[PDB]
Write an enzyme that holds these catalytic residues in place. Sequence first.
Site, mmCIF file in Angstrom:
data_model
loop_
_atom_site.group_PDB
_atom_site.id
_atom_site.type_symbol
_atom_site.label_atom_id
_atom_site.label_comp_id
_atom_site.label_asym_id
_atom_site.label_seq_id
_atom_site.Cartn_x
_atom_site.Cartn_y
_atom_site.Cartn_z
ATOM 1 N N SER A 94 41.275 40.284 43.223
ATOM 2 C CA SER A 94 41.123 38.885 42.826
ATOM 3 C C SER A 94 39.672 38.466 42.657
ATOM 4 C CB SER A 94 41.794 37.962 43.839
ATOM 5 O OG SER A 94 43.138 38.341 44.075
ATOM 6 N N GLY A 95 39.446 37.477 41.805
ATOM 7 C CA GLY A 95 38.126 36.913 41.622
ATOM 8 C C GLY A 95 37.050 37.758 40.963
ATOM 9 N N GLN B 197 42.848 29.347 37.691
ATOM 10 C CA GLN B 197 41.540 29.905 38.057
ATOM 11 C C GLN B 197 41.578 31.436 37.852
ATOM 12 O OE1 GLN B 197 40.373 29.575 42.402
ATOM 13 N NE2 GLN B 197 38.278 29.108 41.741
ATOM 14 N N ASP B 198 42.148 32.156 38.803
ATOM 15 C CA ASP B 198 42.342 33.589 38.655
ATOM 16 C C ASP B 198 43.731 33.878 38.086
ATOM 17 O OD1 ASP B 198 40.358 35.707 39.402
ATOM 18 O OD2 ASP B 198 42.164 36.665 40.255
ATOM 19 N N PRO B 199 43.857 34.938 37.279
ATOM 20 C CA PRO B 199 45.228 35.315 36.946
ATOM 21 C C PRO B 199 45.900 35.941 38.154
ATOM 22 C CG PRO B 199 43.688 36.815 35.917
ATOM 23 C CD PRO B 199 42.864 35.722 36.530
#
EC number: 3.2.2.-
Lengths: 271, 83
Positions: free
Chosen positions: A166-167, A91-93
């Site tokens: 994040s995100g 999903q997120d790195p």
Amino acid sequence: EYILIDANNYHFKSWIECFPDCKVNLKLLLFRPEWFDFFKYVESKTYFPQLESKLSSYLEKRQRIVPYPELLFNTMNVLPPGKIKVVILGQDPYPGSCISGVPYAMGCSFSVPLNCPVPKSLANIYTNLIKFNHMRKAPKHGCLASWILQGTFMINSAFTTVLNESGVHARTWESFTADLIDYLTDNYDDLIFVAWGAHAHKLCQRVDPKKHYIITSSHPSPLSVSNTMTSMSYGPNPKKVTYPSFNSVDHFGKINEHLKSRNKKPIFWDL
Amino acid sequence: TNLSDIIEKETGKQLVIQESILMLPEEVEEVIGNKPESDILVHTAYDESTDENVMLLTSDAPEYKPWALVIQDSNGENKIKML
């Protein structure tokens, strides 16, 4: 050599060192020609304007985007579309960096460079492989280059984030990812999609379930590994369904058992 | 890094956020008990000194409003704090 990364031998160009002119071109970061058909499709679409421009804004502001640009399409530049056997969505790195300042993010899901601390969700992947005898002992490193060379398409649905954040780019990368996934399910046949967690499961809803094999479980992150995951089945007639916890599923065994059955080479997982 | 500062403030731990996931409110409920009004980011750090996973639960980017803190042992048991 673009996937075998080491943080004690890391001099990849920073985003700004790559585009001191804050104008971001993505054409340049894609080296392998077999992805050209796919790219020029995406180039020919509404969002790629916005995407490159939205990305440029970040440079302007000035936010440290990860992974670095030469690493962005890592998996793609290593793996041509017709040679990928497995799709594994992150999903997120990874948001964090080595104490040296080397980022964890290296252009492909769940992997980190050599001599970089191993984040637990990848640790949990190693625990799973050991559990089901695809691995005797956990490796000292978390670089998954070997798997990708053997056809494991390991990508994050958000291709970038900001260092220690994040995100933040999940939505600007959304269209592009659905287009990549569509492209793989439409134009190739016996692919294995691995859905770890709700979001990967959501993306695998666009996969044609009678062309392709889908493995579904909870996400390997510490909070999820041991829990089940609930959503809709993949059918034309979806039912509400519970999927198994990550640590309970022989992911890589199932991958190989399938590959063998279609007369394909199994993947060697051990490191 | 304000995100690790919050963690430090709550636990006295100085830690590196290594990873995140975004969770739907209903997934959260099943783990936390209380149900958030929207998606939450799970910010995951590891602390080897005590061998626990420390996860800070916030609202989606860009707001990052702290909502809960989870400390999880070797056995997977969660100590849940609301923020």
